[PDB]
From Swiss-Prot, chain A:
It is found in: Mitochondrion outer membrane. Residues 1-98 are cytoplasmic. The C-terminus is required for mitochondrial localization, while the N-terminus is necessary for mitochondrial fission. This is Mitochondrial fission 1 protein. Present with 2410 molecules/cell in log phase SD medium. Interacts with DNM1 and MDV1. GO terms for biological process: apoptotic process; mitochondrial fission; peroxisome fission; peroxisome organization; positive regulation of mitochondrial fission. Changing L76P: In fis1-L80P; no interaction with MDV1; mitochondrial fission is blocked; DNM1 assembly at punctate structures normal as in wild-type. Belongs to the FIS1 family. The chain holds residues 5 to 102 of 155 of the full protein. It comes from Saccharomyces cerevisiae (strain ATCC 204508 / S288c). Has a role in mitochondrial fission. Has a role in outer membrane fission but not matrix separation. Required for targeting MDV1 to the mitochondria. Regulates the assembly of DNM1 into punctate structures, in the mitochondrial tubules, promoting mitochondrial membrane constriction and/or division. Keywords: Apoptosis, Membrane, Mitochondrion, Mitochondrion outer membrane, Transmembrane, Transmembrane helix. One of its GO terms (cellular component) is mitochondrial outer membrane. It is a single-pass membrane protein.
Curated annotation (Swiss-Prot), chain B:
This is CCR4-associated factor 4. Changing F27A: Abolishes interaction with FIS1. Interacts with DNM1, FIS1 and MDV1, components of the mitochondrial fission machinery. Interacts via its WD repeats with DNM1. Interacts with CCR4 and NOT1, components of the CCR4-NOT complex. It is however not a component of the 1.0 MDa CCR4-NOT core complex, but appears to be part of a less characterized, 1.9 MDa CCR4-NOT complex. Interacts with DBF2, another likely component of the 1.9 MDa complex. Interacts with SRB9 and SRB10, components of the SRB8-11 complex. It comes from the Eukaryota. Residues 1-40 are annotated as: Sufficient for interaction with FIS1. It is found in: Mitochondrion outer membrane. The chain holds residues 81 to 124 of 643 of the full protein. Involved in mitochondrial fission. Has a partially redundant function to MDV1 in acting as an adapter protein, binding to FIS1 on the mitochondrial outer membrane and recruiting the dynamin-like GTPase DNM1 to form mitochondrial fission complexes. Plays a key role in determining the polarized localization of those DNM1 clusters that are not immediately involved in the mitochondrial fission process. The lineage of its organism: Eukaryota, Fungi, Dikarya, Ascomycota, Saccharomycotina. Belongs to the WD repeat MDV1/CAF4 family. Present with 589 molecules/cell in log phase SD medium. Changing L26A: Abolishes interaction with FIS1.
Amino acid sequence: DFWPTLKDAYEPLYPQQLEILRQQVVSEGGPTATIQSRFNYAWGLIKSTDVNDERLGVKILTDIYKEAESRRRECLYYLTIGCYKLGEYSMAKRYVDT
Amino acid sequence: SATTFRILAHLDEQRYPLPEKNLPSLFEGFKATVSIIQQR
């Protein structure tokens, strides 16, 4: 249960680091890439300062949640942090409730 | 907009419900990967 804090989610990566995580995703097949590599990219996106990156990061996490039953619990937590950052408190409330 | 985000990231919690004590978190792997990226 080694989970992220609010603090981590608010510090961005360099553009070239995020690009590496992106490139790894594309390499493995994009939306069909491994769960680990998709998450790594989704988190980097959530850390980004760009609201649209953050939204995409949250969308990818939702996709993980859907696909992987064994990942739902931890993803609800990740989803809560990402929705919080975006001001999407109704979503964040609902998720952390479940 | 953000209405498009809300559509694409919509989560039917009833449809995708929650249900393992030996499964490393995804975040652990993120943190290791960002560490190794710092060298490359």
